[PDB]
XYZ file of C-alpha atoms in Angstrom:
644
model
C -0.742 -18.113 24.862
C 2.936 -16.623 25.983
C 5.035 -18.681 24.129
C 1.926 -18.664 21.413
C 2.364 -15.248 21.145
C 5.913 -15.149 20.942
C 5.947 -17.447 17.756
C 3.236 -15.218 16.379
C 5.091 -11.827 17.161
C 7.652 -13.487 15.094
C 5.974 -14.585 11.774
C 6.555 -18.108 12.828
C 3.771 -20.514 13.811
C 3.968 -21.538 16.721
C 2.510 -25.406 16.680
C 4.640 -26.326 13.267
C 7.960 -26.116 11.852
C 8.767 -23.902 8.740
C 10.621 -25.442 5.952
C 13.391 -23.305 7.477
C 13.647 -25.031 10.532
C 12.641 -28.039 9.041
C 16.310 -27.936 6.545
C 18.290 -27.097 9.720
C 16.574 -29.441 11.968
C 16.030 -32.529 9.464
C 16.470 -34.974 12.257
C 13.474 -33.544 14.130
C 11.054 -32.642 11.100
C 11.756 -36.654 10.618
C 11.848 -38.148 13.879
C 9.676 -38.713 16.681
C 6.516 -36.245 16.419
C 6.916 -36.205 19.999
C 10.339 -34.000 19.552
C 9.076 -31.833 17.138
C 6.681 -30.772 19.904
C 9.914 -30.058 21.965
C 11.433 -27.968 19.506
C 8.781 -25.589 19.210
C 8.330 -25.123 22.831
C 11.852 -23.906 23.238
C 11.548 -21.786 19.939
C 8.818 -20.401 21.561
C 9.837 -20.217 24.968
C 13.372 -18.851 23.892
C 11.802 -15.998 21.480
C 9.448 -15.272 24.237
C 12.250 -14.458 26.666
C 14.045 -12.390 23.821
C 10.900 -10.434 22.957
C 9.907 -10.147 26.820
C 13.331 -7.762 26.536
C 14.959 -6.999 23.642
C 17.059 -4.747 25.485
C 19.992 -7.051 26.503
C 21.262 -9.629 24.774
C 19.572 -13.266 24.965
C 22.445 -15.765 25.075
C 22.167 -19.734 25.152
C 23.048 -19.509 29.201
C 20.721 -17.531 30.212
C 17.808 -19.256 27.551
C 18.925 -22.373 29.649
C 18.647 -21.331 33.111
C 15.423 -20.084 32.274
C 13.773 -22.944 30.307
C 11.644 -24.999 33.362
C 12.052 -29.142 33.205
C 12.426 -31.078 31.127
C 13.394 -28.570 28.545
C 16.268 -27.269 30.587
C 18.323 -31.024 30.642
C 18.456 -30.929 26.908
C 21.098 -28.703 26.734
C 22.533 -29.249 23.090
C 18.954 -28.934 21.995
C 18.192 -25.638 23.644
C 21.920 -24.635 22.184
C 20.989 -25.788 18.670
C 17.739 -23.796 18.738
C 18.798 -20.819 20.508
C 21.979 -20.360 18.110
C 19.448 -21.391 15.267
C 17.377 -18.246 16.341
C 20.273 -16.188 16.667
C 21.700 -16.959 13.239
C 18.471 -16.104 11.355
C 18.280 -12.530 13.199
C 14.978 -13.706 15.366
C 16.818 -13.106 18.870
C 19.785 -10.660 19.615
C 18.781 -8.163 16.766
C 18.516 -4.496 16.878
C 19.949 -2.687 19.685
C 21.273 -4.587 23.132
C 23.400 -4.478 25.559
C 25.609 -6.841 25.053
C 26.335 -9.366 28.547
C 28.824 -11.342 26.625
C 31.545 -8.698 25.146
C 32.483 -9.073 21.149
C 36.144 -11.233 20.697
C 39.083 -8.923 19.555
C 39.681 -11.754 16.860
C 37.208 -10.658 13.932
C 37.039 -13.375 11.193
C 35.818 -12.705 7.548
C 35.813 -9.539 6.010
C 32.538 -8.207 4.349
C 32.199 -4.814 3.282
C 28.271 -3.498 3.027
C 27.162 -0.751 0.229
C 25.108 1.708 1.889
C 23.989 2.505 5.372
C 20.392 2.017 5.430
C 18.161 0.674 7.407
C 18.860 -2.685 5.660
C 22.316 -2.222 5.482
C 22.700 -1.208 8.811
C 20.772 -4.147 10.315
C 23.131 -6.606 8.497
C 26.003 -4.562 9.299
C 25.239 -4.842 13.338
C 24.374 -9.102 12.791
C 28.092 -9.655 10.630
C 29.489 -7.165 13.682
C 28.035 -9.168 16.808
C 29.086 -12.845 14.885
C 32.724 -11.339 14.802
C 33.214 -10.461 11.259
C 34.869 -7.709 10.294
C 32.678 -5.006 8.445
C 32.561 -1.878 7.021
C 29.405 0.063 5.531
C 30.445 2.129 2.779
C 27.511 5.398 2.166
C 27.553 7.599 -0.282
C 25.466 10.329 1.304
C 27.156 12.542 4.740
C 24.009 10.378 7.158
C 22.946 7.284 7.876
C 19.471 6.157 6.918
C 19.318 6.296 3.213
C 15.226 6.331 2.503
C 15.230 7.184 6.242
C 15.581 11.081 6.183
C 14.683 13.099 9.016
C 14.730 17.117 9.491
C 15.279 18.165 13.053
C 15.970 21.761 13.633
C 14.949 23.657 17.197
C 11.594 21.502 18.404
C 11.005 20.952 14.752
C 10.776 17.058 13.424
C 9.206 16.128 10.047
C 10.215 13.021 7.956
C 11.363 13.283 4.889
C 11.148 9.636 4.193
C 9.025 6.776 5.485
C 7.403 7.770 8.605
C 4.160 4.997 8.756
C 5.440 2.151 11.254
C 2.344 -0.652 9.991
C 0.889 -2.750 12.953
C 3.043 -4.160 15.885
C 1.298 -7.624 15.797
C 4.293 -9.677 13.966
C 6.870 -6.435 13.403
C 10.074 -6.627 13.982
C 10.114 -2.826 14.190
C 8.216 -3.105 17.189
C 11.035 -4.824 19.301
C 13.434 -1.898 17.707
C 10.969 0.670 18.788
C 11.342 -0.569 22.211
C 15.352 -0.203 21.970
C 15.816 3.539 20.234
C 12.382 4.746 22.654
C 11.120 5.793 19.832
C 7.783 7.427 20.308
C 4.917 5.707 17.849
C 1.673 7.517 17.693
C -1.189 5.459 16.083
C -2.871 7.570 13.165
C -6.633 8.200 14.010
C -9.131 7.427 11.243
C -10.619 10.669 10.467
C -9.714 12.129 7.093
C -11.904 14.835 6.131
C -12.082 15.351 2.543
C -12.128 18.898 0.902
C -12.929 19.400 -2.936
C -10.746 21.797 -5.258
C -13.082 24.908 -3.848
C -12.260 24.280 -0.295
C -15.677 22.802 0.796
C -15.766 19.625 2.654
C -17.218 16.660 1.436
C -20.567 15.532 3.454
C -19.944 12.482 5.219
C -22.707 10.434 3.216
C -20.418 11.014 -0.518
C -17.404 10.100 1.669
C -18.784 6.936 2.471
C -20.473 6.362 -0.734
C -17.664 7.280 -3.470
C -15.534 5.212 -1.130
C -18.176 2.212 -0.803
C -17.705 2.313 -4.670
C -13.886 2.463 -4.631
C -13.808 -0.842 -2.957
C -16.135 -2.212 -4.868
C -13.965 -1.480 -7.793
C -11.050 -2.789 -6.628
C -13.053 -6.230 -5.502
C -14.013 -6.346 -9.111
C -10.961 -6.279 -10.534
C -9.389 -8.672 -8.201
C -12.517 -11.377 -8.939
C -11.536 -10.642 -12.886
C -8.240 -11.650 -12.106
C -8.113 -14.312 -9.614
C -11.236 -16.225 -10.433
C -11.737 -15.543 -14.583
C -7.633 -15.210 -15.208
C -8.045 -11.895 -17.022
C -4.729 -11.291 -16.617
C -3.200 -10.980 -20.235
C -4.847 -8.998 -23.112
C -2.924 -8.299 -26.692
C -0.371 -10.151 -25.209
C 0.367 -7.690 -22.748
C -0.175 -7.867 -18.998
C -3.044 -6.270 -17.694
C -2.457 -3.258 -15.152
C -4.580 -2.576 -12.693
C -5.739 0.345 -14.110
C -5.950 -0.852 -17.065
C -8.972 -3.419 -14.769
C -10.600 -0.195 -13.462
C -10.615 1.594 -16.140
C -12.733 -1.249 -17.816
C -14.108 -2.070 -14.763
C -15.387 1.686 -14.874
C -16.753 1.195 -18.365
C -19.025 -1.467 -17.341
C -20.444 0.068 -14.394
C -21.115 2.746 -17.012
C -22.908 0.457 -19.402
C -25.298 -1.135 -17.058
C -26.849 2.459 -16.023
C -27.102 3.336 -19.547
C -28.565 0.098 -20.273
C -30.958 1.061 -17.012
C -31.846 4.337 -18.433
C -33.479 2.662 -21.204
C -35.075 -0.181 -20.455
C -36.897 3.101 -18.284
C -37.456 5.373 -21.222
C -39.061 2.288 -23.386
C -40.860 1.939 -20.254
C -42.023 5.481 -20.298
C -42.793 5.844 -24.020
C -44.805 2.104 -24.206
C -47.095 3.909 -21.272
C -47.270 7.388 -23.398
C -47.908 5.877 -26.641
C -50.748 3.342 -24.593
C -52.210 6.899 -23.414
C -52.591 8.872 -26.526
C -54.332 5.354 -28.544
C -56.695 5.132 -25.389
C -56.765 8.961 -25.348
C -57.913 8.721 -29.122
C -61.212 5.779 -29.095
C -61.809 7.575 -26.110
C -62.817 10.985 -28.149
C -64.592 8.604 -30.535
C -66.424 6.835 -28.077
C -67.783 11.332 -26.922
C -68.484 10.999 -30.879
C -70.017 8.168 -30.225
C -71.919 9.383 -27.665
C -73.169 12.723 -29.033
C -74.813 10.734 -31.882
C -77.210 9.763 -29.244
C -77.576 12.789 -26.822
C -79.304 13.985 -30.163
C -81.600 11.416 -32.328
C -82.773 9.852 -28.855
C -85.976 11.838 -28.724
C -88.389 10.803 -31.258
C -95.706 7.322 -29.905
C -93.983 3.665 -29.401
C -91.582 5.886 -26.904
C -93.003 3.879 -23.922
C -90.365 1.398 -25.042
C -88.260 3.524 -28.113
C -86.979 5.397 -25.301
C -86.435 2.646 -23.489
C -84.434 0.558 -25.612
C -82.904 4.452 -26.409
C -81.750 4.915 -22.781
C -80.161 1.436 -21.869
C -78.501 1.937 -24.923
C -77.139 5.335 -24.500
C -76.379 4.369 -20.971
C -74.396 1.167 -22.111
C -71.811 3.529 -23.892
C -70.994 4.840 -20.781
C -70.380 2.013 -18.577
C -68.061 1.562 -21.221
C -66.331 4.982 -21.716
C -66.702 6.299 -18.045
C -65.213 2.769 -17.403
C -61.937 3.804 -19.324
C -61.214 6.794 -17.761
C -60.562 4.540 -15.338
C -57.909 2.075 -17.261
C -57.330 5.458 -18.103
C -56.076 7.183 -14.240
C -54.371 3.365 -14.046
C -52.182 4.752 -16.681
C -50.976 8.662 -15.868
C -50.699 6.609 -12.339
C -48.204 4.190 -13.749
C -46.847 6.826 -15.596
C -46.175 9.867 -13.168
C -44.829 7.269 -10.940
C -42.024 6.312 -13.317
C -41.124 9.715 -14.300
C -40.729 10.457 -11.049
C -38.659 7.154 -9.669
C -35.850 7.733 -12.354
C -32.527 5.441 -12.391
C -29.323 6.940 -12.007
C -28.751 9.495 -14.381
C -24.984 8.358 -14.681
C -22.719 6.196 -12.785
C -20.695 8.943 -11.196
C -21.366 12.193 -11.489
C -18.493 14.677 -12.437
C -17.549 15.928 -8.530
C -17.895 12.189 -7.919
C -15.625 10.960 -10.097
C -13.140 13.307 -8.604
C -13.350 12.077 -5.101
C -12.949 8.535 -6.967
C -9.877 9.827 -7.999
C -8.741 10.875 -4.616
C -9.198 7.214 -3.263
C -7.179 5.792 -6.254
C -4.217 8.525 -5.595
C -4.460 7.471 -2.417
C -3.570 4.080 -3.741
C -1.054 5.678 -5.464
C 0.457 6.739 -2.381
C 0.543 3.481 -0.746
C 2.325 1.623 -4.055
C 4.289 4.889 -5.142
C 3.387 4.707 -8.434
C 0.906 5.143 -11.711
C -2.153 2.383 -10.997
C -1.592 1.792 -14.795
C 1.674 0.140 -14.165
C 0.770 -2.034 -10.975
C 0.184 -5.297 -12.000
C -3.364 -6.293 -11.961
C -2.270 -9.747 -10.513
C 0.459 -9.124 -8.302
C 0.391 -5.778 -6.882
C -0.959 -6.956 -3.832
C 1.269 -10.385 -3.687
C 2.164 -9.780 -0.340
C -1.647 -8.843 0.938
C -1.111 -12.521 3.175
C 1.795 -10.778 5.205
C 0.111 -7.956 6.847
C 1.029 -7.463 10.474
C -2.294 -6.785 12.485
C -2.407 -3.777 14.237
C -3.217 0.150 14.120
C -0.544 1.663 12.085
C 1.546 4.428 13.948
C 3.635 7.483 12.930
C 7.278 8.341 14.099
C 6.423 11.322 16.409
C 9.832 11.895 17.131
C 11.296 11.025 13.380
C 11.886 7.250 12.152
C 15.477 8.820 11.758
C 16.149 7.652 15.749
C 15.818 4.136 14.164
C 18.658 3.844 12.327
C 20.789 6.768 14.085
C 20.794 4.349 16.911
C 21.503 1.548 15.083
C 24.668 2.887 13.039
C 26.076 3.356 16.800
C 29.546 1.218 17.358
C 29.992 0.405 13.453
C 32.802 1.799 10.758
C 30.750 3.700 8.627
C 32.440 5.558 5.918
C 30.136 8.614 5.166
C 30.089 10.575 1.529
C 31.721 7.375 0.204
C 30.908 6.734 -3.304
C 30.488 3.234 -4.561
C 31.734 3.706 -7.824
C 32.781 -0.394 -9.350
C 32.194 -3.917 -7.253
C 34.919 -6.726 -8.446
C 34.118 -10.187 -7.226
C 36.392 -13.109 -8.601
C 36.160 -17.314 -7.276
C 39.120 -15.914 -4.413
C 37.867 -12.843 -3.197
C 35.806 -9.221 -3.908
C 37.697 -5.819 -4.338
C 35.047 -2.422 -3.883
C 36.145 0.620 -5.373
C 34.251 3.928 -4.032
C 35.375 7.798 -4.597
C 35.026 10.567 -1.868
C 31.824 12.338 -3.076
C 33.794 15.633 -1.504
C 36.981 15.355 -3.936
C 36.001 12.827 -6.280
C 39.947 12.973 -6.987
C 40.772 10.476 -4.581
C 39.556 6.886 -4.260
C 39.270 3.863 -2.335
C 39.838 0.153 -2.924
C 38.621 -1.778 -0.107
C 39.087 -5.616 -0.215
C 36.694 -8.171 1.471
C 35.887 -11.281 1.192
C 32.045 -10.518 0.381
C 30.323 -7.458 -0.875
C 26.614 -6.776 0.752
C 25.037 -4.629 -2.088
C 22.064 -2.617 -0.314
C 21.715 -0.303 -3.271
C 18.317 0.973 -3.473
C 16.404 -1.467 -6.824
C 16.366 2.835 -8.499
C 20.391 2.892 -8.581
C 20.096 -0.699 -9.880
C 18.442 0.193 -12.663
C 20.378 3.340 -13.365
C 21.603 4.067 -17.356
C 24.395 4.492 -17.521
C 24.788 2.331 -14.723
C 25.915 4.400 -11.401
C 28.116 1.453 -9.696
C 30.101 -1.034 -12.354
C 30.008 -4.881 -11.561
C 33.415 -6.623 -12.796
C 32.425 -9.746 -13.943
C 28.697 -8.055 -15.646
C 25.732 -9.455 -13.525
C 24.182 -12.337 -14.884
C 21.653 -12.339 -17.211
C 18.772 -13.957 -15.013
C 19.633 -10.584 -12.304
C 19.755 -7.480 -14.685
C 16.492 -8.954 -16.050
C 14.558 -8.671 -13.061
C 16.250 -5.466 -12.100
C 14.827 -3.849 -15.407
C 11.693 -6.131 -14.888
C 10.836 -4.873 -11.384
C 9.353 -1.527 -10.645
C 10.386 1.031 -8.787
C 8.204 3.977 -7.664
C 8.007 7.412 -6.508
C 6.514 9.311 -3.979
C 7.087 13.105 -2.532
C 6.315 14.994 0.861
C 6.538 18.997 1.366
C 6.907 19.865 4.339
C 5.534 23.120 5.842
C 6.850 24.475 9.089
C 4.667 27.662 10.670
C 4.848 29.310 13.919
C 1.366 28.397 14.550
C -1.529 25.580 14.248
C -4.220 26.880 12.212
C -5.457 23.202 11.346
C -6.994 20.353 13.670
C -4.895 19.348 16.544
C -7.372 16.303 16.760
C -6.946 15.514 12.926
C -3.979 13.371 11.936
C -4.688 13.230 8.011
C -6.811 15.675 5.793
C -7.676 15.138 2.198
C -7.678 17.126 -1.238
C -9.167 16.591 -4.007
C -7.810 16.938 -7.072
C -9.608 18.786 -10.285
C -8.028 16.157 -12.975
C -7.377 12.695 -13.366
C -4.318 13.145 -14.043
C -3.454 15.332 -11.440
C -4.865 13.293 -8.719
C -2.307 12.731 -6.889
C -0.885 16.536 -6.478
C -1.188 17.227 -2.513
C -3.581 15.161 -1.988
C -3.083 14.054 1.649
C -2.311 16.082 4.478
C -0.079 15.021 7.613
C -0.548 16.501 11.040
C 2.301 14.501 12.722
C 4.041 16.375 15.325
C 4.729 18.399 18.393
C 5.773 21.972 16.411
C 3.622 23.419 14.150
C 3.943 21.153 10.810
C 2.058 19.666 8.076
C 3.248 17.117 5.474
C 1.600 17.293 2.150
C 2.080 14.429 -0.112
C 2.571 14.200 -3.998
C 1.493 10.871 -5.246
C 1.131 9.396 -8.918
C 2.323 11.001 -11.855
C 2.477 14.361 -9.992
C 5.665 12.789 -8.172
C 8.022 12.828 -11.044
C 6.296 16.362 -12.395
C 6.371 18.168 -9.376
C 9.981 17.600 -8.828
C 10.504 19.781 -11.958
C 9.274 22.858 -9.897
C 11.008 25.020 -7.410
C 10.214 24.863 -3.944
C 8.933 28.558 -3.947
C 6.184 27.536 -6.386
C 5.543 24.093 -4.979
C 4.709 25.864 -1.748
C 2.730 28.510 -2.528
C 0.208 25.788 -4.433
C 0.707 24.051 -1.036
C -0.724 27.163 0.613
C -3.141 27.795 -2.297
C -4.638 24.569 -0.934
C -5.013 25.160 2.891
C -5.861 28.685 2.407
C -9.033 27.380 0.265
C -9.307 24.688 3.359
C -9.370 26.775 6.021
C -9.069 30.745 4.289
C -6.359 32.855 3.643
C -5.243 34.897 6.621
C -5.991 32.091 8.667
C -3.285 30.470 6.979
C 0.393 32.346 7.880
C 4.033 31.910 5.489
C 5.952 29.113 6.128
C 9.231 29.603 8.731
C 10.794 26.648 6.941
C 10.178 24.030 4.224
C 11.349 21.231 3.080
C 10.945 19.722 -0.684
C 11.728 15.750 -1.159
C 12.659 15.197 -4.707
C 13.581 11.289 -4.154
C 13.810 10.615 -8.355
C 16.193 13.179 -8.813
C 18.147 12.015 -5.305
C 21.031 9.945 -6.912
C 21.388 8.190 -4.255
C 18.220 6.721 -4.233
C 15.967 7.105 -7.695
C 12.894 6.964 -6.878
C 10.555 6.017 -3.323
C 10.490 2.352 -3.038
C 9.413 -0.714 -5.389
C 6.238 -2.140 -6.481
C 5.251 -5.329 -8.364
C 4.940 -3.686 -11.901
C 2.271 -4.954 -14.708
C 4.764 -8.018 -16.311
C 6.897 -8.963 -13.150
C 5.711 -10.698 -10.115
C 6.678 -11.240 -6.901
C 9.102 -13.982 -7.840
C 11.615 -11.442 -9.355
C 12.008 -9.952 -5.790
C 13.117 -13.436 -4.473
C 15.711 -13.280 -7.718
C 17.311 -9.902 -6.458
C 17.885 -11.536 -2.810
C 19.582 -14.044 -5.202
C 23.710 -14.232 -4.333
C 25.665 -13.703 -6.937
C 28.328 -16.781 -7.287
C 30.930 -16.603 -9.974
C 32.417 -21.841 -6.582
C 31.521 -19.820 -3.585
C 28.577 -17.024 -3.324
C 30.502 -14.026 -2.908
C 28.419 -11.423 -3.685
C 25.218 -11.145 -1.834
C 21.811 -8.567 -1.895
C 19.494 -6.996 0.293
C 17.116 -4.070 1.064
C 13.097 -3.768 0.158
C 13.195 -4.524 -3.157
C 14.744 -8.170 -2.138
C 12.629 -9.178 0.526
C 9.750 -10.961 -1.486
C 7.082 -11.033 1.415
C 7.728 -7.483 3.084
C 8.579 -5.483 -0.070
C 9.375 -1.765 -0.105
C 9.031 -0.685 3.993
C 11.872 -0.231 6.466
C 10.477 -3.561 7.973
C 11.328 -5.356 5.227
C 14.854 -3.786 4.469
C 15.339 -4.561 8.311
C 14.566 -7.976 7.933
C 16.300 -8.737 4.394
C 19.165 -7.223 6.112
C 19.088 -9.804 9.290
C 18.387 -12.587 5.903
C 21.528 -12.006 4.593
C 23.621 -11.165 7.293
C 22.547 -15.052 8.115
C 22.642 -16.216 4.726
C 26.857 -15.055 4.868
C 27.710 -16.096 8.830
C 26.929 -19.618 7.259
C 28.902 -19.362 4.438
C 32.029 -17.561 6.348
C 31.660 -18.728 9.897
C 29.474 -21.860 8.004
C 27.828 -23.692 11.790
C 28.503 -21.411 15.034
């Protein structure tokens, strides 16, 4: 399945046309079954060839010489695909050589707000169709949310560092053109409670068993009974466990006493058999005396199978009797669960749901209970893998060959029906300005700047209505990493991840993962949740030294040596970013991030968005900021360049 898998490396199906193709190519998608067949085999064949070696550029004479019969006599079909592919970033994306040099003559002029991944992606695509563009970035790098620190052998990122399953990601095809060395992350993550004692692989498995269950619950309550509104207000997710939680704790209360009226019924049956058995000895003693008084011969006789009778009655209880302390010694013994989760369990609970934290950068209590997971359908399969060599080569590589214009300010984006003017400041002299004019204006700004009051960068006309109201709809999270460079490895070499567990709730999410990622000697520690924004109020000194508290519990002081060098993300405070990365927040859905990739059109679209927080289907990863990057780059060839 080559040209199978080529479709399938490419999010594309390979034996059916997506509405996509089936707009461009209306005359196939409505013809002759027989030449949709076609079509797809040299989509699939030409992808194949691209992906087979994404390290020169694919062009429309070489797809053609290498297409076998009949395919290869169809030339303006193969041309129509091939540039088709092209177009829509699928082929020639990245980093190539290029066999077919760029024309002097550069048509259009589109200038792109900030140089990350996304931006950078676009930037290359408007470059290699001849436009003429410039990326305008406020910060003195490249890479925006892509931050990596590289001093002597030491690497550590700052930023995202998780590349998520090759099968279907674009990244992989980049990965192949930077070299950039992926390590998949083993498994293993050994939890440690607040006291520094691991946590026996049975709880592990169990607390986690139940955190799953949990989050099944809440997703049956919400797609399957609709519990997604209460009071009016949307229902967080959360807001589901939390309740979720409740009812768990019900039913063993419930359990625990349908088992003490169990016990009691048996206890009170005892002491009322207990009691007509001491009347029945009574009974019995008024016999064992009397019973011994010349018509004996049969006066005893009558005497003794009488006496006797009262015995194969009583002696016959005792029996009904040890049927009873059987029943009940066997009950107060086999006890129900005393509570649903004990205290220590509830805190390992805790650590799986900061952990979830983690992956949405944010409070559970704002995720939406129905959407947070909109985009569970796009997964790419595959083992995820860390940057061993820092995600920064990605877009280092790709900023190679374009007109960036470091610490450079975006301060006010004009846009009238004949052209866009983009006024930025030099963040070194913030006397001086710029006023760059383009026809188009690529706005990459991170969804956190967006939503910035007072507003960071001024649009002249206002944005519409419809677009500020997702921007303030949508949510944007936070996450933070610490990074702790020491001379030596005092942890795991095997271990890639380690766990702690927090004491509180609501500090669940302070250092709670561990990251043993690279070739020096460094660990990553992780602030999640509401510790995020918290944490960032405290100096690095004191941020540290909890860090070391920590390890020092993990694996005892002494053992653990002072840090050479640290680093401290505080991405909320980071103006030039606000927060991590966004999340479908409880009252939003996924449609709002199909909205933001919206163009902006005061006769012609002029201005046009992109980065995670745009791309509806691969939302907040460098994946999808690559990708809504290729979108629009596409999206404005058409509309400048309009058909090759």
């Amino acid at each position: 399945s080559g040209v199978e898998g080529a479709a399938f490396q490419s999010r594309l199906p390979h034996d059916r046309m997506t509405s996509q193709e089936a707009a461009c190519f209306p005359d196939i998608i409505s013809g002759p079954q027989q030449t949709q067949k076609v079509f797809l085999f040299i989509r699939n064949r030409t992808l194949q060839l691209w992906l087979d070696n994404p390290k020169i550029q694919l062009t429309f004479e070489a797809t053609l010489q290498q297409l076998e019969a009949p395919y290869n006599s169809d030339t303006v079909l193969v041309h129509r695909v091939h540039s088709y592919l092209e177009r829509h970033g699928l082929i020639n994306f990245g980093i190539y050589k290029r066999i077919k040099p760029l024309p002097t003559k550069k048509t259009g002029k589109v200038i792109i707000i900030g140089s990350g991944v996304s931006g950078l992606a676009a930037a290359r695509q408007l470059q290699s169709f001849g436009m003429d563009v410039t990326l305008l970035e406020a910060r003195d790098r490249v890479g925006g949310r892509v931050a990596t620190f590289r001093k002597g052998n030491y690497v550590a990122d700052l930023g995202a560092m998780v590349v998520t399953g090759l099968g279907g990601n674009p990244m992989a095809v980049v990965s192949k053109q930077v070299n950039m060395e992926l390590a998949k992350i083993k498994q293993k993550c050994p939890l440690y409670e607040a006291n520094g004692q691991a946590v026996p692989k049975e709880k592990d498995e169990m607390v986690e068993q139940e955190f799953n269950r949990l989050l099944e619950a809440t997703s049956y309550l919400s797609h399957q009974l609709d519990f997604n509104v209460l009071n009016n207000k949307p229902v967080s997710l959360g807001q589901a466990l939390e309740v979720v939680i409740q009812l768990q704790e019900k039913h063993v209360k419930d359990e625990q006493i349908e088992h003490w009226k169990k016990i009691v019924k048996t206890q009170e049956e005892l002491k009322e058999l207990l009691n007509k058995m001491v009347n029945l000895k009574e009974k019995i003693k008024e016999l064992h005396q009397q019973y011994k008084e010349i018509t004996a011969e049969f006066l005893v006789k009558s005497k003794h199978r009488d006496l006797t009778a009262l015995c194969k009655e009583y002696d016959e209880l005792a029996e009904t009797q040890g049927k009873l302390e059987e029943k009940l010694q066997e009950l107060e013994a086999n006890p129900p669960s005393d509570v649903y989760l004990s205290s220590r369990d509830r805190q390992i609970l805790d650590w799986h749901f900061a952990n979830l934290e983690f992956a949405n950068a944010t409070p559970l209590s704002t995720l939406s209970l129905k959407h947070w997971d909109q985009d569970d359908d796009f997964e790419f399969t595959g083992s995820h893998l860390t940057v061993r060599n820092g995600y920064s080569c990605v877009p280092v590589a790709l900023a190679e060959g374009l007109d960036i214009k470091l610490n450079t300010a975006v301060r006010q984006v004009r846009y009238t029906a004949s052209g866009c003017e983009v006024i930025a400041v030099n963040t070194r002299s913030t006397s001086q300005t710029f006023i760059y004019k383009c026809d188009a204006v690529l706005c990459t700004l991170p969804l956190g700047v967006l939503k910035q009051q007072p507003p960071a960068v001024q649009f002249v006309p206002p944005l519409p209505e419809w677009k500020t109201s997702a921007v303030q709809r949508m949510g944007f999270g936070n996450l933070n990493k610490v990074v702790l460079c020491f001379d030596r490895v005092f942890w795991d070499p095997s271990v890639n991840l380690f766990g702690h567990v927090g004491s509180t709730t609501a500090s669940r999410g302070e250092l709670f993962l561990f990251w043993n990622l690279y070739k020096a000697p460094i660990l990553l520690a992780l602030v999640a949740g509401e510790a995020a924004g918290i944490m960032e109020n405290i100096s690095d000194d004191v941020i540290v030294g909890r860090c070391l508290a920590i390890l020092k519990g993990i694996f005892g002081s002494s053992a653990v040596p002072q840090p050479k060098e640290t680093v401290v993300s505080r991405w909320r405070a980071d103006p030039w970013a606000r927060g991590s990365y966004s999340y479908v927040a409880a009252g939003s859905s996924g449609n709002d991030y199909d909205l933001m990739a919206q163009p902006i059109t005061p006769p012609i679209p002029r201005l046009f968005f992109a980065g995670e927080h745009t791309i509806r289907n691969y939302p907040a990863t460098v994946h999808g900021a690559l990708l809504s990057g290729l979108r629009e780059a596409g999206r404005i060839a058409d509309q400048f360049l309009g058909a090759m």
